[PDB]
Amino acid sequence: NLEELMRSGDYAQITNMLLNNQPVALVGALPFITDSSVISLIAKLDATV
Amino acid sequence: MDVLYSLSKTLKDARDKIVEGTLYSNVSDLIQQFNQMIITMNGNEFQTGGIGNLPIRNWNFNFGLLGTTLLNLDANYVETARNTIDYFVDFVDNVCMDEMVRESQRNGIAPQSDSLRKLSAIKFKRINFDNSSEYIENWNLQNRRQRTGFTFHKPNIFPYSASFTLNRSQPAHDNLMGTMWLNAGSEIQVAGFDYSCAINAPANIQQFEHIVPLRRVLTTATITLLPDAERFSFPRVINSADGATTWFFNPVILRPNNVEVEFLLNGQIINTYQARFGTIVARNFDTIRLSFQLMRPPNMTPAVAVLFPNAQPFEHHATVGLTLRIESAVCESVLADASETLLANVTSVRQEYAIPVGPVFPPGMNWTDLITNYSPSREDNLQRVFTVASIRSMLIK
Amino acid sequence: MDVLYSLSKTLKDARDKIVEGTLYSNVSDLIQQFNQMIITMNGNEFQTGGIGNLPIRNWNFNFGLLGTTLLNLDANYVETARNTIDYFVDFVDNVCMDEMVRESQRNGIAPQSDSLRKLSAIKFKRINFDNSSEYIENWNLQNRRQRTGFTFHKPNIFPYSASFTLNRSQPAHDNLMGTMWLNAGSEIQVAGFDYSCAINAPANIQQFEHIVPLRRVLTTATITLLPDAERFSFPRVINSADGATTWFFNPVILRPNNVEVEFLLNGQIINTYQARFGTIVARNFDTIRLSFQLMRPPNMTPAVAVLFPNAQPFEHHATVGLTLRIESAVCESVLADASETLLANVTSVRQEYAIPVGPVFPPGMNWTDLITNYSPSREDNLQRVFTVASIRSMLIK
Amino acid sequence: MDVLYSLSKTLKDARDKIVEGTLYSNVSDLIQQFNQMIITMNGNEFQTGGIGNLPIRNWNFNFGLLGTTLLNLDANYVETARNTIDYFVDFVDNVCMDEMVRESQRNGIAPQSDSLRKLSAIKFKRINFDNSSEYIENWNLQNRRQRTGFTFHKPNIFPYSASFTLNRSQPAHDNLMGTMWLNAGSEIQVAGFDYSCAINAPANIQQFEHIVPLRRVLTTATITLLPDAERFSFPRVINSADGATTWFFNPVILRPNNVEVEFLLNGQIINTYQARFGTIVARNFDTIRLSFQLMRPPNMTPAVAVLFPNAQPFEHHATVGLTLRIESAVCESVLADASETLLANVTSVRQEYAIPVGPVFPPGMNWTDLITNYSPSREDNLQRVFTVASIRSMLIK
Amino acid sequence: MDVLYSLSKTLKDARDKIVEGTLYSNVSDLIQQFNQMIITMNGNEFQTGGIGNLPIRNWNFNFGLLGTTLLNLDANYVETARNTIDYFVDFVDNVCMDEMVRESQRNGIAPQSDSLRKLSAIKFKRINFDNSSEYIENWNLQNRRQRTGFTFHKPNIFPYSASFTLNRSQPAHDNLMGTMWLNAGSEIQVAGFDYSCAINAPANIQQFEHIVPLRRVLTTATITLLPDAERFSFPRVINSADGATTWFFNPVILRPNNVEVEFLLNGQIINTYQARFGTIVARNFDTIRLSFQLMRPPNMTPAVAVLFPNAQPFEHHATVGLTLRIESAVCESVLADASETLLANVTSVRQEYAIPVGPVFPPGMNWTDLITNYSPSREDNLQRVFTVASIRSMLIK
């Protein structure tokens, strides 16, 4: 839950699962970048956000 | 092994300390360790079982951390804690049953299951917590080669050995002389008998002797030493040495004259006790030497003088006994006793899942055959499996 | 019940941790729980006693909080702490003696005294602390219907039953056959006797059998199994079945041929042991079946052949015994044993204040009559009163 | 004494809690106490030993404080902690062996060694920590004169006294009457015998009685009371009262008619039990009175009627026994039992270093002679030395 | 289990409350629960069956929510509701038939089917609804270990036991004495007969006795107690005890003199009734003791005096009977009776799909063999399967 993550502020976990590359599903209500590019698909842009 | 005890200690404390309505400062140092445990155990997968009828279970850990923001713990926090604790308790139960069931002749002190070999990394080293139980303390002290001591109440140091010895015998079996004994659990009952009641012995005194070697060196043992061994004091018929014929034993009991109980360590007399009964102490020993003797009574009433003739037919046979019961003792190696249930847990796990007989332990976990030939590799395997049994006995009741 | 254990655990820790000169960081998490306890207990009044000679005492709590501003605890803080602790210890002592004395046939697991019914509210739920003792752990696990285990050293699972059985008998009582037994505490001593020594039995073998049903299912029991039951091995005169006449028993002891000890759970053979003595293990059982047999010795020396004629006058009677002693066992229900003193505390409180016999427990707290008919309502009452006895045994020595 | 327990409790916890890889919040309150200990103990010198073969060792403390800046404890911190802990453990080992070896007739509850007299200052009072073990709790409660209780499993309350009493006797020793007993450990085995089997007693009933005074008042004792004392049930020859001649004892066993077991405190009957066997309870007592009687059986089969003639030659002697075994009891004074090893540690230290016999304790630490004459000065010395033995048994395994 | 009852309660109410033309305020609180059910159950897949001939069915839930915008429910809403309800009713029917068919010796109170193990998560916990039926109320109360009671009309507490007992017998079988009984369902019919009609008994009175132990403790039982057992009052020929020969029984009926019906709980007399017939009450009992006696009539007309001679040929045999019928009783454990059909549903599901005999239940679901050995594991399995049978009996008629 991204809302409870925003509330607590201890992180502790998404820091861990982000540094050590562990699969995860962030439940929130984020806005997104729609992106129409195959070069941006090959360059692997989503791991950088 | 250290991290397995740490997992079980935190799960025990988190069943104990994390309750409904308790203050947060009572559990403020436990929730941080439990969160460190969750953070360490996430992303890892385990596989337990695969020997005998122990089923293969796959373990995957994906849990959220516990909240650190309450003042009094409400029932929401208790229910999510009970969920995470029940999953980890099932995991550590199956890891302990996977570790107690395996053994190795080569190096038994090493972890044998795949899950505990995976937990022995430094990635899992931050799980570690206090090591306060006796078995994990002696594990950590013997992992650095220091002196340890397990305190046992009535230790099963003696293998079951009920037998006898005929110092004087013949195929008629009407004039016999020698000792009989029962070594069982922590109790030695010995009785030397003479059928002639030393009527031709020099100075009417027959010397008996019974030497019990131990397998491990006991230390600071309180021992109840009584005379008049009760089991070898009633009439019985006994098979011979070759098992061919049987012979009759009709005892009358004299008191033991000149009892000398010696506690030998490497052949040196550490403690000695001359005609002192009741509770005695033996500070350091691995051999117990009982030296009692039968003296013919020089003054006898007419009710006694008809029992012991000078001629051959002895219908009443002189018998002199002792009883030696180790009440409590400190031993450096692991044993079984009347207080713990760890051997019972090991045998229950090995018998519940129909486990084949391996290279080290006796078939059916025979403790008599395990303490008869108590090799150091079997000692290492027994200590490892007893430590894991103590861990599971902390979690699983 | 949880808050009563919590009160006693904090009072025990505050007698232990709050001492003179100790550092404040050692007691910084205990003083907050003790202040939460004072804040919760103020303004409330209680009334303990009122049954038998237990006197009615009224309890009023008006205390100030303890200071949180020292670095090393000086003697002022220790003396005011000792005052507040002594008042709360007297309160919890009288609440525990008010709860162990009461019982109910309807729902015994519920609190019966007025003080513990008042403490079972959520106003008092913030008193709650860690639940680390074995009895409060099994209380909390059985309050959620999970598996529990009480570890007993020599459990009193057998009611006192010293009796016999004559498979072959007559009013002359000179040619008898059957078993005798002593079931006491954790020890079964059984002995089958034949006066003819199987001189007319088929293949000179007489089969004996002794089946002991248990009241509760024992789990992971270490059991010392020895041959040659010592109590039924000397001559005695015994009243008959109707108590009319007495008959004489002059035993000579053969060894038990073909011992089969079976541990039955719901009629299914869980563990079996064929001619194996020493320490055995029984993982899960509620019935113990001992099947030993008397075989006439085919080769006998002339000292033995005069004992067993083919004719009628048998002055020496063949007798074969076994001894089975449960050293330690894990039982899901509460029992009594040789290690704890909880039954002694319950009987001491019920006998000190001259308490009338209620609907559930036997008169005089007869443990033989309590384990003879061990109903589940009596089980619930016994577990509740043993838990309160464990709490008071923590506080009151 | 309080600071010695505090030193040992911190060293035990710092061997347990300070391990490699553990989180700092698990040990954040222990490192502050251990640093307070280092700060207090620096600059001080001690001298241990100097009696018997216990060597004189000089102790100087110059240590740096431990770091308070890690998140997970690495192996550097563990190794420097193990160095400081090993030096302090050797120090407290030699202080405990210097204190258990000394005694005083004047005031035994005071510290006798120079090191513990130096530790009894208020400079060392900030070492103090929690006092959670049973012996230091009872030490602190008896230092303020409150009620204490030591819980013993099979306490050694009875001195070894195997003897007899002839209520009816003659130099022929063919028609005797009286009691025999064995008081050993926690077990009383008593047996009253009559050779005539009450053939001339009024109403064919002979009354026996056996009164055992205790040395300290036991409280809440669970007691296994069985009939038919097993040791006095087989034939034996026994020396006379003056030791001149020997007399023969050929028992046949009747059951005990009209058993009355009374538990006397100051001559007042606290508990009484009339013909009830199995497990009994005795809430408060210091005298045990067994009153059993031998009744001649009025109906006897022809196998029994040949045993007991009306005339003089009795080849079969009527014998009636009881067995009383205190399984567990709470005693206010210190004792020895089958559970602890503290007496074994005290005797091991006094026998290892060849210590001369002092003014208080018996030569060789004879527990029979120590509980035979159990004076209050000997009680104070025994409690002090057992408390120090418990401290050393915490540190040294 | 709670969510399965909740699914069935909502489907029952939504077949009942959601009808054509009904007002929306009548169903405004049911449609929200049914929409919560649809929202919870979407996206989940289940698999039912797979044992015996029960076919494997896969369940996938993809449904739209029901409308919340009508004032009176029109037929469109009723038809789409009937579609969704019929799919969920078929699902819960197959889940209940998958759960009643399975059993476990280890922990029978846990769900055994895969679908109900999947429904036991907290994701499905928002399905939960009121628990108003008797079986789910007693399920929820025994899940917290409180007292329960099932009210039965004529409970099948007695196993079928039609047998007899000959207190006086011979191979001629012409002068017999003893009791006969029929224990069936809720009815005990007992009849003691004497062929001599107490012509040589002391005071012409023969005492009979019949003790029926129960398996579970009944509470607040209304019992019709009538004299003159009707089944044992006509002439019949009966096989012997070994089944070798047959003997004839020609009864004439006397009235039962001195009827004493006692209701024993743990050997204590709870209720007693002396010569009172009609409807009686027994508040708490698990043993029924009937003590009636046959008295020879001292005054007899010449039509009666020819029936009972003083000599041997008795062509008319005196017989005295009682009948005891438990009309209704409250039992804490589950049973079968003449009111419910739950045992019939369980046996119909187990016999329809040709299910192999498992480890717990008797072959063919023999209720006589199930109540003969009514173990607590079998009790837990029986309660679980009866609760699921009650759920399916709510949905499926």
Ligand SMILES: [Zn+2]
């Ligand atoms: Zn013991």
